Amino acid sequence: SAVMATYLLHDETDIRKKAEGIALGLTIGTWTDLPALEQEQLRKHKGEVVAIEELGESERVNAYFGKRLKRAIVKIAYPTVNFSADLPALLVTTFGKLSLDGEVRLLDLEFPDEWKRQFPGPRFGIDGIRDRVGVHNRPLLMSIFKGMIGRDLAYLTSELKKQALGGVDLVKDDEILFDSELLPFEKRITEGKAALQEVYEQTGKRTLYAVNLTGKTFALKDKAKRAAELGADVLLFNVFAYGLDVLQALREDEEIAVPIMAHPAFSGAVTPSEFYGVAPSLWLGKLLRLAGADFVLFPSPYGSVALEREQALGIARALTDDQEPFARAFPVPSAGIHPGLVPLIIRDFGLDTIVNAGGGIHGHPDGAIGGGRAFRAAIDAVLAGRPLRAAAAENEALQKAIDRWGVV
Amino acid sequence: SAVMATYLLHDETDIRKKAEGIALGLTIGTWTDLPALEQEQLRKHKGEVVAIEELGESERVNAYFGKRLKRAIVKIAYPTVNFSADLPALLVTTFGKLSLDGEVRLLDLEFPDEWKRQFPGPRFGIDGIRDRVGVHNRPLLMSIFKGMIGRDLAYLTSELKKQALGGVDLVKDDEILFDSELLPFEKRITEGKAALQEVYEQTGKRTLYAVNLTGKTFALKDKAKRAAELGADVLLFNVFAYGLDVLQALREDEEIAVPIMAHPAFSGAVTPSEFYGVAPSLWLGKLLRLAGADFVLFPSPYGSVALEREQALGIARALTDDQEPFARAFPVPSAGIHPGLVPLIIRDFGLDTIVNAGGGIHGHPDGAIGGGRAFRAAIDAVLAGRPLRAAAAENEALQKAIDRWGVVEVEA
Ligand SMILES: CCCC(=O)/C(O)=C/OP(=O)(O)O
Ligand SMILES: [Mg+2]
Ligand SMILES: [Mg+2]
């Protein structure tokens, strides 16, 4: 039983030597200087290099570093009996001191099934979320509150109702919206709930509200429990500013049991480099799903703020792979999304994804209501196999959206 | 009142345009379309670009990216009224969505004094730690347990004694030593304490034990409190695997009040890039001190695993700057350290530093006892105004260390 870590290494020195040094140094330390009884005692704790795939040198990389760097994908096995069954221990064991060892980038982690079972996965997942939103035959649609910093509850409820009237399935606080005297956490929840209930009585559709869960770590469970009691729909959480273990703690608390939406804020401090950090499929995908996120937002491959296509697809794959012993998490490609991108979003991510937009909603000529209607029309058109311009002939909101941002 | 963030940007599009976009987009979002009444009401929340220092375009960077990238240092002011007084809010506000915006690297964060005061800083700091171990003037000496994974308490106590008999001031668990049936957290503390007092009884040397504080986040305060009750000397903490806010929580809990040693594990996932992440001086220095670390271990600028000299010095400066409303944190340059490096360590970091012999101390020809003796002899030599080799001629432990690893020249 061992967790196998896969790394990308760049080095001017022997990579196999370094890999072997890591496997031994980061597990039992030394081996050949150990007495007979001690070797049989520590054998189960000895790390091992599982494989080394040589990639050959890159002129571009060499030029950048001004040196000749050998490249390779290295796989190392760390016995699970070497650490406690928790994410902080996993990270320290597989990329603690090693993260400081020059050019080393963590690409993936693979675990025995028995080990994975010590973790929760999403509480609701795609199926649970669809049941709660009441939408099963199409991708979901979400809008983001914009310009709320410094505004009051009257403004919040007004803005919340407009987005809901646009037909969005969910509305989330912007991740930079923190608790204040004007907008207290509990008041956002209770007043938002009432406002959405009024819209529900007018349309028959109840839009869900993902409220930002912020503040100090040791106060999170208490307010999350209050959120559950007050009837909050979803908890938005900037997990990377805390720790993966905190997300897991929120997921495992039976007194919370509210869907959790993980935001990518600060994940960019770890994922972009070619030589360092942790790959996004693992950092935003595999680990967040395992830790308990029901939704995971990540930069789409389309906007100004984006991810390479295969990187984004890799995250979605990790979130939905049904071979994992966890519920599937909702992939939410984000940033700069507008109606004209709906055809591509569905083509790339399928039906089990969420169309998420802030400016794409509020920037519509007719406000949030028009913005939401344009998106709903675009989604229906794609599912029906109709070009957006054809569908726009029968939907003014979509026409205005297409005229403003175009079709991709 | 605003927090000023300093960023390094690489971009093929207008940097000033992007800067203004960040100041506005990450604060109030819109401004020009707001009526006079709303502007005056939201003015206090409006972010602003403070300065933009244009740097020379780099041929090396351009070749790497295969494009022409303009470079600049951008400073943005974020009103403190926009976010709550906690580190997670600070990070999300100054480098949340922005960390995803292409080539942007956070270099520094400047806080108004009034804001800093809502944070603890180290509980003990350099002065407090020196009093706890009873060592003034000279740099401290610390060693790390070797190969403890899979071992039992009898092995731990025997190994702990060897290190203390070598004269080290502090011994720390390896950061990858997690709790187990063989080595329970509380037992390491109590058995370790007994072993160290026995050593004091025979040699007169006082040695502290930094025990690894691990496990799930919400069980940390309970065990730290227990550690305090049991008299633990220092709590070693892999802060970067937990979040800066957790370190602050441990520091602010009056029922703990035990020195905290922050380990750099995982910080390398954030600090090394030339275009992304967060600079070491901020991530390992300024923020850890503010959060409550009494000691901060970081890659020294000497070994295989290291940091550029100015980078390492920058961390030490942030940890010890007397201009901050916080106690100074002990800088502990680590990795590759050996007796032959003591002169350079003291020349570079001064007397208020800790020589971290790490696990290498066990590699001395005569084991940890000889290894510690070699280090203590080297420290005394420098303080006595003598070359290591002069002292080596009178100290066999030091001579063996020099013969084994050599002496690093300090002459400029
Ligand atoms: C990748 C997450 C982006 C985000 O947090 C946000 O609020 C986006 O807004 P729009 O780009 O849709 O206007
Ligand atoms: Mg946002
Ligand atoms: Mg270690």
All domains in chain B, ordered by first residue: 1-119 (3.30.70.150), 120-412 (3.20.20.110)
Evaluate whether A391 touches A380 at the Cβ level (below 8 Å): yes
Task: Name the nearest CA neighbour of A314 among A302, A324, A323, A301.
Answer: A301
Method of determination is: X-ray
Q: Are A325 and A113 in contact (CB under 8 A)?
A: yes
Given strand B354-358, what is the order of strands in its sheet?
B330-334, B295-299, B260-262, B234-237, B208-212, B170-172, B140-144, B354-358
Indicate the burial class of B155 (C-beta count within 10 angstroms; 0-12, 13-18, 19 or more): middle
Where does B253-366 have alpha helices with state H? 280, 287-291, 309-320, 342-349
Helix (H, G, I), strand (E, B) or coil at B23: helix
Cα(A58)–Cα(A62) distance, integer angstroms = 6
Q: Counting beta carbons within 10 angstroms of the beta carbon of residue A388, is it exposed (0 to 12), middle (13 to 18) or buried (19 or more)?
A: buried
- Kindly state the tokens that stand for A183: 């907008």
Q: Which helix (H) or strand (E) holds A354?
A: strand A354-357
Q: How many CA atoms lie within 13 A of A343 on its CB side?
A: 14
d(CA A388, CA B156): 70
In whole angstroms, give the CA distance from residue B337 to residue B384: 21
CA distance B206 to B141: 12
- Let me know: does A123 contact B249? Beta carbons within 8 Å: no
Main-chain dihedrals φ then ψ at residue B73, nearest 5 degrees: -105, 120
B196: left (phi over 0), alpha (psi -120 to 50) or beta: alpha
Instruction: Classify A226 as helix, strand or coil.
Output: helix
Helix, strand or coil, per DSSP, at residue B291: helix
The Cα–Cα gap between A365 and B391 comes to 81
Task: In whole angstroms, give the CA distance from residue A38 to residue A41.
Answer: 5
**By three-state DSSP, how is residue A95 classified?**
helix
Contact yes or no for B241 and A102 at CB 8 A? no
Neighbours of A222 (CB within 10 A): 11
DSSP notation for A323-337: TSSSPPPEEEEESS-
CB contact (8 A) between residue A100 and residue B175? no
A352 a known binding residue? no
Q: Min CA distance, A93 vs chain B (Å)?
A: 6
Amino acid identity for residue B58 in this structure: S
B228 Cα: distance to centroid of ligand 3 (angstroms): 23
CB A148 within 8 Å of CB A156:
yes
The Cα of B48 is separated from the nearest Cα of chain A by a number of Å equal to 15
Contact B216 A245 (CB under 8 A): yes
Which of helix, strand or coil describes residue B373? helix
Breaks in chain B, after residue numbers (C to N greater than 2.5 Å): none
How many helices (H) and strands (E) would you count in chain B? 17, 12
Query: What is the rounded CA–CA span in Å between residue A2 and residue B302?
Result: 33
Q: How far apart are CA A372 and CA A164, in angstroms?
A: 8
Task: Answer whether A228's CB lies under 8 Å from A256's CB.
Answer: yes
Ligand 1 in reach of B43 Cβ (< 6 A) = no
Can you read off the two tokens belonging to residue B127? 């002065």
Q: Which residues lie below 8 Å from residue B48, measured CB to CB, with a gap of 6+?
A: B2, B23, B76, B77
Q: What is the resolution of this structure in A?
A: 1.7
Output the DSSP codes for A199-225.
Answer: HHHHHS---EEEEE--S-GGGHHHHHH
- CA B321 vs CA A122, B326, B327, B338, B356: distances in Å: 45, 9, 9, 27, 21
Q: 3-state DSSP call for residue B257?
A: coil
C-alpha pair distances (Å), B133 with each of A15, B27, B171, B206, B320: 42, 47, 12, 6, 19
Strands (E), A80-223: 104-110, 140-144, 170-172, 208-212
The tokens of A241 are what? 């500013």
- Which among A146, A266, A273 has CB closest to B96? A266
Give the count of alpha carbons within 13 A of A16, CB side only.
5
What is the DSSP annotation of B130-179?
HHHHT--SSPEEEEE--S-TT--HHHHHHHHHHHHHTT-SEEE--TT---
